[PDB]
Amino acid sequence: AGRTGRRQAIHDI
Amino acid sequence: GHMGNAAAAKKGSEQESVKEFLAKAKEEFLKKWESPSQNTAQLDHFDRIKTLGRVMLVKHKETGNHYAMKILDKQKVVKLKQIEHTLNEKRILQAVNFPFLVKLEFSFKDNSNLYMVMEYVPGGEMFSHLRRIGRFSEPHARFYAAQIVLTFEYLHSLDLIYRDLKPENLLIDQQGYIQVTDFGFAKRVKGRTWTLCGTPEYLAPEIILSKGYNKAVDWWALGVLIYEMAAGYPPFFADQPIQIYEKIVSGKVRFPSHFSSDLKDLLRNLLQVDLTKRFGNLKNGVNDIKNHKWFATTDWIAIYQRKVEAPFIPKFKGPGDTSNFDDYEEIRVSINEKCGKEFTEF
Numbered sequence: 464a465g466r467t468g469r470r471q472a473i474h475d476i
Numbered sequence: 477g478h479m480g481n482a483a484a485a486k487k488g489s490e491q492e493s494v495k496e497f498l499a500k501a502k503e504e505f506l507k508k509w510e511s512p513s514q515n516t517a518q519l520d521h522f523d524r525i526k527t528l529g530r531v532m533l534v535k536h537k538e539t540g541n542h543y544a545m546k547i548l549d550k551q552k553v554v555k556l557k558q559i560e561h562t563l564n565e566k567r568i569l570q571a572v573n574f575p576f577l578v579k580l581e582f583s584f585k586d587n588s589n590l591y592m593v594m595e596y597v598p599g600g601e602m603f604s605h606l607r608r609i610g611r612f613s614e615p616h617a618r619f620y621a622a623q624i625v626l627t628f629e630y631l632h633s634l635d636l637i638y639r640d641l642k643p644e645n646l647l648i649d650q651q652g653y654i655q656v657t658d659f660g661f662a663k664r665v666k667g668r669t670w671t672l673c674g675t676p677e678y679l680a681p682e683i684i685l686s687k688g689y690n691k692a693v694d695w696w697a698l699g700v701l702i703y704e705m706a707a708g709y710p711p712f713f714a715d716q717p718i719q720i721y722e723k724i725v726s727g728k729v730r731f732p733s734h735f736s737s738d739l740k741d742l743l744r745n746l747l748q749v750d751l752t753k754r755f756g757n758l759k760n761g762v763n764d765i766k767n768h769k770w771f772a773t774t775d776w777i778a779i780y781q782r783k784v785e786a787p788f789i790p791k792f793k794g795p796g797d798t799s800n801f802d803d804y805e806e807i808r809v810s811i812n813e814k815c816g817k818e819f820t821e822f
């Protein structure tokens with residue numbers, strides 16, 4: 464199981 | 477050895493020609509880096525057609541040419557501490573030149589927003605095509621990977637780190653070649669940098685572990701991309717970021733049974749937690765990657781010249797076509813200029 468949709472960047476951690 | 481005389485001489489000469497190309501490209505980059513473009517259009521020069529990602533498809537009124545206009549709300553950039561990153565993005569985009577990097581055509585600003593107007597790439601995100609088809613065959617994945625290898629070889633020679641490789645950030649053009657977008661985390665870095673940023677599934681271990689890190693994070697991310705293109709899912713796959721991070725730092729990766737041994741060997745050397753062993757970080761540089769067996773059939777010059785037949789040509793009905801992008805649900809320029817001082821250089 465895992466993320467199949469579009470993935471957002473992270474700015475911190 | 478592995479190569480005979482003719483092959484070793486041709487390869488050595490090819491590698492020297494790369495050095496020559498890159499030295500000229502750096503001279504050109506630095507001239508634009510030191511004297512950046514600014515205020516080369518205004519909003520009134522385009523018609524807003526449709527929202528594509530905000531990123532808007534627009535039509536230039538004088539030329540009739542279509543563009544992708546990225547709109548940044550000055551106030552939201554400050555609250556998010558992305559001021560330096562946004563300044564990086566525009567300064568880098570206006571200075572680079574490479575066949576697989578999206579081309580910034582105009583930029584400007586007003587009281588409320590920053591505008592970046594880029595060439596319109598109509599084929600959609602690689603992400604959509606990959607999820608639709610499931611996975612790419614190894615030759616198909618390799619065609620795209622070769623473009624990323626050349627693009628990173630170019631960027632890194634300019635001391636630029638890209639820091640957000642993923643299928644979401646790669647568009648397919650009308651000839652089936654790649655256009656790298658999303659320079660929001662790109663940075664000019666002589667040696668190390670320290671910002672924790674990127675996308676969880678693609679983060680190198682040294683980022684997760686809060687180390688000073690270098691351009692080798694991009695080569696790790698290439699490993700993640702090639703794996704995902706060829707598998708249909710990425711190597712470190714979990715519902716929550718904390719679970720993703722634990723897998724990344726473990727030093728373990730499992731491969732689908734349909735991966736070739738050549739591909740697995742390449743990926744073990746890219747997805748290498750030990751920086752003293754990671755391809756792209758060694759004495760031989762990018763050549764460890766370009767000379768790997770999995771790329772033995774790749775004509776690197778032919779890829780650069782866009783003379784290789786693409787595996788897939790996106791459907792394209794006409795100049796305004798948005799069929800390869802999604803549907804989305806107005807522009808509010810305020811009477812008072814906001815965060816003017818923070819974005820003087822833009």
Ligand SMILES: Cc1cncc2cccc(S(=O)(=O)N3CCCNCC3)c12
Pocket residue numbers: 528529531544546578594595596597598601644645646647657658801
């Ligand atoms: C539509 C578009 C089409 N031609 C050129 C573009 C240039 C930049 C951005 C986009 S985008 O797909 O909205 N996009 C936003 C962020 C998501 N990652 C991919 C880049 C373009």
